[model samples]
Target: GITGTWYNQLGSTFIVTAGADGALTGTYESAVGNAESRYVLTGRYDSAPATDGSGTALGWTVAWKNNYRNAHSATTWSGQYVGGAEARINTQWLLTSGTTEANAWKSTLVGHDTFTKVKP
Candidate 1:
């Protein structure tokens, strides 16, 4: 169910390129004001398995670079992907470190994204 490109209201987008055999990999691009960033992601997608068994879930650990700030951050995103043209996901961002802006943004980070399936 975790396929296609999804857009966020904040002019960001996630393009999931693969989701088979418990492997989920994708590309994420975000734009916030004058700051723009992109990430080459690698993670997993599973349903109630032995490891953590948390129903349907989306997990990705991404290493992203901020094009405007000349910096980067490592983040682990945990959430579920509900299938629909207007589906919503609740994600919790686990961040390690970054610039001041990244820290501030992560401090109040809420994984709330309404997704529209742009393709199959």
Candidate 2:
């Protein structure tokens, strides 16, 4: 299981656990709009490790259930786990916020981050 606390450059982290069937469950703690509140997350192990041992693909999403500065948002991430020397989870994420409104043309945020294992 790719279990533990994974953190990124944005000061956000998620606690996750992988089950026998590759199902993932976790709570996302953000440093963004919701700050310290715990949000829900759903994810999975995307694929098996390659023969070259590049990494194992995984993905997750945190749907912002609460209000953040009066705005609502959600974040989804796709990344891979590389162990040993270059060990880390580098992920690309998309944040969509303020969608509760009709004119949220500029509400999409795109970012990438490298996450390291903080604790097991």
Candidate 3:
């Protein structure tokens, strides 16, 4: 069984194929947390992967969601940011699933704990 985190911070694209008449369809959405977040995909499973798993996955598109506190400062350790960018996760974590092991998902935010808030 394969296990580990899946960090597509750069974003990822999801595709799907139809079975009714052999048709193809495509859609995209941000994997990041957001209110507009919704499953942009809807279809039936035609087949399974080598692991033999049947399920549905919401289509995704190669896109990026900027959450960085700053662009230049992002490269360094810390700095002020007028416009924030995508922040990255940097920590180790333990995988836990009820009592059994399940699929793994990548996590970047870790260690170096810090926080900030701007006045509106």
Candidate 4:
């Protein structure tokens, strides 16, 4: 059911395809942030009803290498599908970056992002 092109708030693109082994594979194209290129995505999902009680529980990540500082950063998005009157992939995100620099918990960025399949 998650095999399709999805778009999140801001302007990133998630082109996804799920496998029988609960593996999620895809490519993430960016429209926001300094990393403005496509990156490989890997994650997992629940085949049955997920713990979140939505349609499916899923998580994905993308690494950034095209930033101006030449530093690397990765973001993991964890969320579930909500269906009924409306449908969406509601999620929260955690971002870690700058391995050489001290990265404190306070410095790590956390946020929310909801994804929806693009209207075909």
Candidate 5:
């Protein structure tokens, strides 16, 4: 039900939990960037399983403030739940607001990242 610990190739960790109504609440820890950051995220989860047995197709959008950079970020994740509690997600990290010179939501694209569940 998306209540598990997940990780990306960048060595980021996401500890997520899903409520009965598919409300998702989670924490993200990014360790690979210039500075490590932690953030709390809350969003809705699409729980519908795939019809062709390709696994569940899940999507969510979460907004958080980077604890280290003092910047706000909105991240979206779209993935297909493969078997064995694993999923491959095309994650996008967008800068919504920050102290930098760039305008809101303007930053280099942090594209797709695979998330694998390490715990149930």
Candidate 6:
């Protein structure tokens, strides 16, 4: 069964915040992960339906900024370096080790592939 939770693609963490329906609907702070810098994402839940053969799925549109890579300005690009977006059709589940698992679109767009789960 799929639960209501927001997660990064690599299955590191799920986001929980004070949002509508107790779902993650705000900015998600990222912790330091292996070979990746901490980043934050803002996403929303989708209740349309599960397109992954599950009862339901958590659909999210995320905008995140990479701490590892920065714009030429040394300024900072949170969502994308130069205007980027990421959308996912995700479903939460339990791994063999009882860990929370979420499957989603790795990179729905180009140049916006800033997901820690997705390769740069």
Which candidate achieves the best TM-score against the true structure? 4
Tell me how many clashing residue pairs each candidate has: 0, 0, 13, 0, 0, 2
Query: Which pairs in model 1 have colliding backbones?
Result: none
**How do the residues 1-120 of candidate 3 rate in per-residue lDDT, one tens digit apiece?**
001122323342233344443222433233433312322333232233233332222121212223422111111112111113532222222212222233234322222212122111
State, as a TM-score between 0 and 1, how close model 4 is to the true structure: 0.81
TM-score for each predicted model, relative to the true structure? 0.64, 0.80, 0.18, 0.81, 0.68, 0.30
How high is the CA lDDT of each candidate model?
0.62, 0.76, 0.25, 0.77, 0.62, 0.33
Per residue, candidate 2 scores C-alpha lDDT tens digits across 4-108 of 887777777878887667778988887766545777788988545677867878888887774543236778898887787646887889988865466688788
Off by over 4 Å in 2: 66-70, 98-104
Cα deviation of 26, candidate 5, in Å: 1.2
Off by over 4 Å in 1: 33-37, 47-55, 66-70, 98-114, 118-120
Ranking of predictions according to TM-score: 4, 2, 5, 1, 6, 3
Give me the runs in candidate 3 sitting further than 4 Å from their true place.
1-9, 13-15, 25-27, 31-35, 39-120
Instruction: Give the per-residue lDDT digits (tens) of candidate 5, residues 1-120.
Output: 468888888778888887777677878886554435667777665666556766555566545555455435466666654655445544544434344665534643456777776432
Mind sharing the TM-score for model 1? 0.64
Q: After aligning candidate 3 to the native by TM-score, how far in Å is the CA of 3 from where it should be?
A: 21
TM-score of the candidate numbered 5? 0.68
Comparing 1 and 4 on lDDT, the stronger one: 4
Clashing residue pairs found in predicted model 2: none
Which candidate model has the greater lDDT, 2 or 6?
Answer: 2
Q: What lDDT, from 0 to 1, does candidate 3 have?
A: 0.25
Model 4 residue 48 lDDT?
72
Inter-residue clash pairs, candidate 5: none
Evaluation by lDDT, superior candidate among 2 and 3 = 2
As a whole number from 0 to 100, the lDDT of residue 107 in candidate 5 is 47
User: Candidate 6: where is the Cα deviation over 4 Å?
Assistant: 1-11, 21-23, 26-35, 46-54, 70-120
Which TM-score value belongs to model 3? 0.18
